[PDB]
Amino acid sequence: PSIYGHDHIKKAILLMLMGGVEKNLENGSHLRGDINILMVGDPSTAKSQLLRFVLNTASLAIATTGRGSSGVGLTAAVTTDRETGERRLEAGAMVLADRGVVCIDEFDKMTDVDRVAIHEVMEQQTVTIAKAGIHTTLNARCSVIAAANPVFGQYDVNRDPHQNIALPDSLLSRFDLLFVVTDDINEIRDRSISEHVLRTH
Amino acid sequence: RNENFQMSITPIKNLLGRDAQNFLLLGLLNKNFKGNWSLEDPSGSVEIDISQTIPTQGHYYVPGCMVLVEGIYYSVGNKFHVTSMT
DNA sequence: AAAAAAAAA
Numbered sequence: 485p486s487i488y489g490h491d492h493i494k495k496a497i498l499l500m501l502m503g504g505v506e507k508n509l510e511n512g513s514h515l516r517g518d519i520n521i522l523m524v525g526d527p528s529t530a531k532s533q534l535l536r537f538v539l540n541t542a543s544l545a546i547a548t549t550g551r552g553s554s555g556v557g558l559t560a561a562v563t564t565d566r567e568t569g570e571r572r573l574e575a576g577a578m579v580l581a582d583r584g585v586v587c588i589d590e591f592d593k594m595t596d597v598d599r600v601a602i603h604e605v606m607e608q609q610t611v612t613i614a615k616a617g618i619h620t621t622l623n624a625r626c627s628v629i630a631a632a633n634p635v636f637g638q639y640d641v642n643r644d645p646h647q648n649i650a651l652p653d654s655l656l657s658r659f660d661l662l663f664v665v666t667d668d669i670n671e672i673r674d675r676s677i678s679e680h681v682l683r684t685h
Numbered sequence: 686r687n688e689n690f691q692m693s694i695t696p697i698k699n700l701l702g703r704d705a706q707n708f709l710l711l712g713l714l715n716k717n718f719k720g721n722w723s724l725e726d727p728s729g730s731v732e733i734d735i736s737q738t739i740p741t742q743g744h745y746y747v748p749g750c751m752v753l754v755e756g757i758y759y760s761v762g763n764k765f766h767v768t769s770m771t
Numbered sequence: 772a773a774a775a776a777a778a779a780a
């Protein structure tokens with residue numbers, strides 16, 4: 485209730501938290517069941533705050549940032565057990581978030597290499613690890629919400645949408661909904677949001 | 686301290702964000718640098734409108750005297766369309 | 772096995 489505006493963003497969040505049913509076929513393999521939402525906008529437009537709210541209100545979710553994560557350790561890791569002395573897999577960031585939702589900040593600022601992990605997971609909702617003699621397919625049917633800022637400091641309305649976003653088209657095509665948010669200067673809305681924020685504090 | 690006033694007046698500066706609403710104000714009525722009549726308050730100043738002003742007779746309206754102004758604010762420009770002065 | 776710093780292409 486403390487976020488002014490963003491009505492349809494809230495509606496999309498509500499539809500995402502309780503998304504559609506998964507369809508499986510004996511011949512059609514697998515059909516994706518949830519919805520992913522991506523947001524891009526100029527700074528200070530309440531994206532991280534809404535993401536934190538979604539994290540707090542969700543039944544199961546994991547917090548992740550683009551710069552402070554590595555794709556190899558984000559899915560599965562190989563470590564040795566102290567008792568037995570053998571090596572066994574450790575679940576990654578989104579494996580723990582199976583059937584949950586994963587929220588990522590600074591999505592555009594993440595290293596390009598790690599992005600392939602998302603390219604692996606969001607494709608078929610299954611991550612396959614093959615390293616040091618371990619062969620297993622791990623299930624991960626999580627939904628991913630991300631927020632990234634454009635290449636320039638502020639969004640350019642007069643420019644091509646493709647050149648405003650640093651991410652490649654391959655991953656952008658997977659996300660169902662693209663939302664662009666800008667803080668247009670308007671004295672009426674400035675007064676309204678100012679009195680609202682002063683009410684909050 | 687007046688008995689009648691217990692309606693409330695509003696500072697000039699708080700007129701910036703709203704429009705199409707009537708208000709009561711008071712301040713130094715004088716001429717700005719450009720040459721128009723304006724109201725000055727410890728908060729700010731605005732432009733006035735006189736073309737449809739009905740005064741309270743029996744008063745010498747001279748620049749430099751505090752006057753109670755009633756009218757509607759408009760944000761198309763910065764014109765406070767006055768309807769009465771007392 | 773996996774993270775982080777350095778010189779050279």
Ligand SMILES: Nc1ncnc2c1ncn2[C@@H]1O[C@H](COP(=O)(O)OP(=O)(O)OP(=O)(O)O)[C@@H](O)[C@H]1O
Nearest residue numbers: 486487488489526527528529530531532533633681
């Ligand atoms: N509509 C709004 N209602 C209330 N607060 C808002 C609104 N829009 C922005 N804010 C405020 O903007 C501030 C900036 O917060 P935050 O950094 O999370 O936003 P952001 O848009 O996600 O920024 P960034 O792109 O830098 O991560 C917050 O303190 C938040 O309260």
Ligand SMILES: [Mg+2]
Nearest residue numbers: 528531532533
């Ligand atoms: Mg933020």
